[PDB]
Amino acid sequence: HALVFSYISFALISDKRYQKKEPLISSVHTKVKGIAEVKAEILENGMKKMVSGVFDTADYTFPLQGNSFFVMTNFIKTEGQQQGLCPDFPTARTICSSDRGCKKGRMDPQSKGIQTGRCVVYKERLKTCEVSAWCPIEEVKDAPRPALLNSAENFTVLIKNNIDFPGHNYTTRNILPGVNITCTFHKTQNPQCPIFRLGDIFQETGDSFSDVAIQGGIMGIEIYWDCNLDGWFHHCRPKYSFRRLDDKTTSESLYPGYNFRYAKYYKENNVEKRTLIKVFGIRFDILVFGTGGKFNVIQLAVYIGSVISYFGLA
Amino acid sequence: HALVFSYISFALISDKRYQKKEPLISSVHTKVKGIAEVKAEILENGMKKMVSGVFDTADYTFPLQGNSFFVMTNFIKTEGQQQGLCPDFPTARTICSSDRGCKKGRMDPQSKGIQTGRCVVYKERLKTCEVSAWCPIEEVKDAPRPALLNSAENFTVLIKNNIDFPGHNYTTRNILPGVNITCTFHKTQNPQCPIFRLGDIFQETGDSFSDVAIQGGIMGIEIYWDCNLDGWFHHCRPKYSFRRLDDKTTSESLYPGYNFRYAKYYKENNVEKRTLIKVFGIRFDILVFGTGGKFNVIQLAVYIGSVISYFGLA
Amino acid sequence: HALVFSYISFALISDKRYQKKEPLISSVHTKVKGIAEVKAEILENGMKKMVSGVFDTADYTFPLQGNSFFVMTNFIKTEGQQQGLCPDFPTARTICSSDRGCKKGRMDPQSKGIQTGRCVVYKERLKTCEVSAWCPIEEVKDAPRPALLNSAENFTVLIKNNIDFPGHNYTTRNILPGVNITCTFHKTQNPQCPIFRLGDIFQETGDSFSDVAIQGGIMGIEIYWDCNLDGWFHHCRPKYSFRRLDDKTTSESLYPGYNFRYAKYYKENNVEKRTLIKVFGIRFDILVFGTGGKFNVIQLAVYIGSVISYFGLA
Ligand SMILES: COc1ccc(CC(=O)N[C@@H](N/C(=N\C#N)Nc2cccc3ncccc23)C(C)(C)C)cc1OC
Ligand SMILES: COc1ccc(CC(=O)N[C@@H](N/C(=N\C#N)Nc2cccc3ncccc23)C(C)(C)C)cc1OC
Ligand SMILES: COc1ccc(CC(=O)N[C@@H](N/C(=N\C#N)Nc2cccc3ncccc23)C(C)(C)C)cc1OC
Ligand SMILES: *[C@@H]1O[C@H](CO)[C@@H](O)[C@H](O)[C@H]1NC(C)=O
Ligand SMILES: *[C@@H]1O[C@H](CO)[C@@H](O)[C@H](O)[C@H]1NC(C)=O
Ligand SMILES: *[C@@H]1O[C@H](CO)[C@@H](O)[C@H](O)[C@H]1NC(C)=O
Ligand SMILES: *[C@@H]1O[C@H](CO)[C@@H](O)[C@H](O)[C@H]1NC(C)=O
Ligand SMILES: *[C@@H]1O[C@H](CO)[C@@H](O)[C@H](O)[C@H]1NC(C)=O
Ligand SMILES: *[C@@H]1O[C@H](CO)[C@@H](O)[C@H](O)[C@H]1NC(C)=O
Ligand SMILES: *[C@@H]1O[C@H](CO)[C@@H](O)[C@H](O)[C@H]1NC(C)=O
Ligand SMILES: *[C@@H]1O[C@H](CO)[C@@H](O)[C@H](O)[C@H]1NC(C)=O
Ligand SMILES: *[C@@H]1O[C@H](CO)[C@@H](O)[C@H](O)[C@H]1NC(C)=O
């Protein structure tokens, strides 16, 4: 019987039932550092074109919102779009033999414009259904075979996390004062370092960075706080882990990868015009969770209340 | 007494107290599909004007951030604003009889500019207090009677949700592999379908889509995960519900509806100029919550501890 | 013994163990009101320049996302940047005596461009390492000594919070119907008022607004819901508190303050060009948390189960 009582007490200390768990409040501020030199040859409208230039912080990212930030790793640029009438891009759905194939007003999910009910030539006696939209229609083409900002794995992200427990009135930040800021996060060498190379994060998660960077993806950074408020056993430090949140469906219907359509509006020769930039990139989700533990007398009284009857039966 | 013990055991199985609840981690990636053809007549500065064009994905929305995305359903465009001196728009607060009514430097909450202390004609011997701001002052006028992007109810939103329970080390996504992607969500016909028509969501919540689309609103999509990790009773699927989070105050002081002031900056004839686009739309909040349940021995020991003393009293 | 039983019952009522706690769902919609007149003298490239104009809502803020909104309090504008070759800005790392000091291709964390391996004059026989980037390189200079939008403390923010408890099926909003909207939040005078002056929030947190506004910071607004669902003791109102989430590291390596690099792209004389606006401001994080309490029979049965054995021992 005594060993059952003792296994009860040990169950208390091991489960930490004497402490009252408190939820975790987290705020995140991130600063991304690095630049990328882009020199590549991109085929546009069947003609070879040269993409060159340097991309600094303002070019490939924007400030974090909703505990998540994004890094553009690749892109496809269509310029000079203007509202008008224009044959749709040749695809399995758009090709037409005659005007009967196109219904005036028909909207297709792959199509970016409303059909005009006419079947017209796109190029060299190959006819698509004419549509009304921003034109010329953006190409239906694959992403660049090497991601233009393939240096995205070399950039470094600095994460600054502030956590507060209101029930215990305890506030602490991810970066303790006096810590040597110059470090690169490592699983064993620098567990508390807040500077993470993106390629390091992809190596930890086992996913090759380049492949994800070609068509875009969603990565996730987990910050764990297992915190104890008792003065005789106190420790409130974060544990960094990395997980790939992207589904990797690899199906055209499921919209694989992470990419969005950017629209820049300008006026030229007294004409309303748009430049459409298809943006491919890796969005990093920062997930912070924690429990605050302090000795609660009432919780210990309820636990004792259970283990007294559980105790007498032994 | 035996029926009290048995009602205790049944209370355990029914409340699932033997399992330890775990918090839910959710990440959301959404892709919106559809286009809207806009043809309408809008009165601008007392003169009839024609608004026409096609709006594709890049025009009426932007990528989701903070587990929420927005769809512009209506708009009001003021163009050519430039910094300068200019009579404010005629309202109950702005109309002045003489220069004494305007105090130089006075800032009014409805006014977008600082008064210059002068009372000047706006149009046809009707005087407003002259202000310093981006001018001409945007009209104080109602939204278009039919929302310009009234097709907003026909668009379809694809929601992709990844949930993880860290305590149980269990990860699953909203879309199971192999599910037929071609579907439209229905309460009974397609409960697991991740494609939702916006008008479907507004019909479920009982709110007419057009009315909300005229002046904007805030809609909310709820995803519930009641998940059980035990191998003998395992089920971890989402439940979709829809709720209107917008307050619908319908009071000018409470800023009714959802709308924001967009600023596009350009330079013309060596002059700094701005175009102000008042954006009306429906912001969709995706709310995901869940509990992870697995058999915990210590929890069962504490419960047993209570029900043994509760038991002996019977 | 009777006093131990009674201290148990009092422990129940005081800890509210008879009620089952439910998590809190929060959605936030905020509308910011006010304008700022900016008249200041800013030194640019060693030459005095005059910054003047009026900033309305669209100029200094954008809609809240992820339960947080931002207000630009200060800025530094570099205009006319274009891709090319150009000497880096003179700093401790950039100054070069000869071409040997610069390595072709070297990327420096403080530098915004890739070195070309050449050491060239910046101004008056003072040589920096030549780099390839958007040029001229933005100045490495301090923020304006008075924040250009120093009126940021006078603006007013309206916060509208909707909370829902799903387990109890109870929904309520921050603003009750019929409340006089005209109010300014005060700790004692107006505890339920949803209109907060920014300078009021900084006075509550004890941080001078101007200092934070010069280089930017992160502020946090806490909304507490302690809600009871029982009809005989029902109260579900918010408690507003204010806390400064910014770390205030004041170290160049830790990127002190809150600021981000904004990029506006334009084309001039058939040349791709960029204007880089360094944005300093105060980001307000709205944190809402709550517990829903209703009488649960099973919870009371487990508590009774503990306190019966705890009871008999006395
Ligand atoms: C949130 O705060 C903002 C911060 C920045 C911007 C500007 C912006 O849209 N930049 C985009 N990046 C580029 N171009 C564009 N657009 N980067 C390129 C720079 C040169 C040449 C490029 N060529 C092709 C594609 C991208 C290019 C981005 C979508 C961030 C990748 C807007 C913000 O919101 C108002
Ligand atoms: C987050 O990523 C971004 C994605 C896109 C944009 C461009 C943008 O502001 N588009 C806006 N939409 C339109 N015009 C504007 N501005 N749509 C119209 C298209 C033609 C004619 C229109 N005419 C009147 C009103 C809107 C029009 C929008 C505010 C989204 C409704 C910026 C982003 O942040 C950098
Ligand atoms: C999210 O919805 C958007 C709402 C607005 C904008 C426009 C914008 O970027 N405005 C910026 N504010 C200014 N200029 C810029 N850029 N304000 C100035 C107005 C005159 C003169 C100024 N001069 C210097 C610095 C700022 C100035 C801001 C970054 C908000 C401070 C973009 C949005 O995303 C698509
Ligand atoms: C990252 O930097 C290292 C060292 O400069 C270089 O060897 C490597 O090729 C870079 N990676 C990419 C993708 O450019
Ligand atoms: C939180 O703890 C600090 C510790 O010094 C104390 O000064 C402060 O008053 C506490 N907060 C409250 C609300 O009691
Ligand atoms: C920080 O660490 C780096 C390398 O680990 C070292 O070069 C540097 O001197 C350290 N800084 C301090 C202040 O110790
Ligand atoms: C949505 O589409 C249907 C079928 O094309 C059409 O009958 C309906 O009028 C559309 N709704 C709007 C608001 O355009
Ligand atoms: C989570 O479960 C999987 C199941 O195969 C296992 O391989 C993995 O090691 C587990 N994670 C941890 C941290 O133990
Ligand atoms: C999916 O369902 C649609 C209609 O419900 C049907 O036309 C289509 O053939 C289905 N796809 C598969 C692969 O069964
Ligand atoms: C805020 O407004 C008051 C009253 O108009 C004024 O005295 C004060 O100087 C203003 N503050 C700033 C920073 O402009
Ligand atoms: C929530 O409570 C209201 C109170 O009238 C009730 O009408 C509604 O049916 C309840 N919801 C559910 C899902 O039972
Ligand atoms: C609201 O309060 C203000 C000042 O506190 C007062 O001037 C106004 O008349 C009040 N409104 C109502 C409807 O009572």
Residue numbers in the entry:
A (entry chain A), B (entry chain A), C (entry chain A): 34 to 347
How did the manuscript describe this experimental structure?
The P2X7 receptor, an extracellular ATP-gated ion channel predominantly expressed in immune cells of the blood and the brain, is an emerging target for treating refractory pain. P2X receptors are trimeric ligand-gated ion channels that facilitate extracellular-ATP mediated signaling along with the G protein-coupled P2Y receptors. For instance, the P2X7 receptor requires an unusually high concentration of ATP (EC50 ≥ 1 mM under physiological ion concentrations) for initial activation, its channel activity is facilitated by prolonged or repeated ATP applications, and it opens a membrane pore large enough for molecules up to ~900 Da to permeate. Here we identified and mapped the binding site for the P2X7 specific inhibitors for the first time using X-ray crystallography, and demonstrated by electrophysiological experiments that those inhibitors allosterically abrogate conformational changes associated with P2X7 receptor activation.
To define the structural basis for drug binding, we first sought to determine the crystal structures of a mammalian P2X7 receptor in the presence of five structurally distinct antagonists (A740003, A804598, AZ10606120, GW791343, and JNJ47965567). Surprisingly, all five structurally-unrelated compounds bind in the same pocket formed between neighboring subunits, which is juxtaposed with the ATP-binding pocket. This drug-binding pocket is surrounded by thirteen residues projecting mainly from β-strands (β4, β13 and β14) in the upper body domains of the neighboring subunits. Drug binding seems to be mediated mainly by hydrophobic interactions, especially at positions deep within the cavity, involving F95, F103, M105, F293, and V312. Despite structural diversity, all five P2X7 antagonists fit within the drug-binding pocket, highlighting that the size and the shape of the drug-binding pocket play major roles in determining the affinity and specificity of the drugs. Notably, drug-treated P2X7 receptor exhibited similar levels of fluorescence anisotropy, which drastically decreased in the presence of unlabeled-ATP. Together, these experiments strongly support that all five P2X7 antagonists are allosteric non-competitive inhibitors. Our data demonstrate that all five tested drugs are allosteric and non-competitive inhibitors, which is in contrast to the previous studies showing that A740003, A804598, and JNJ47965567 are competitive inhibitors.
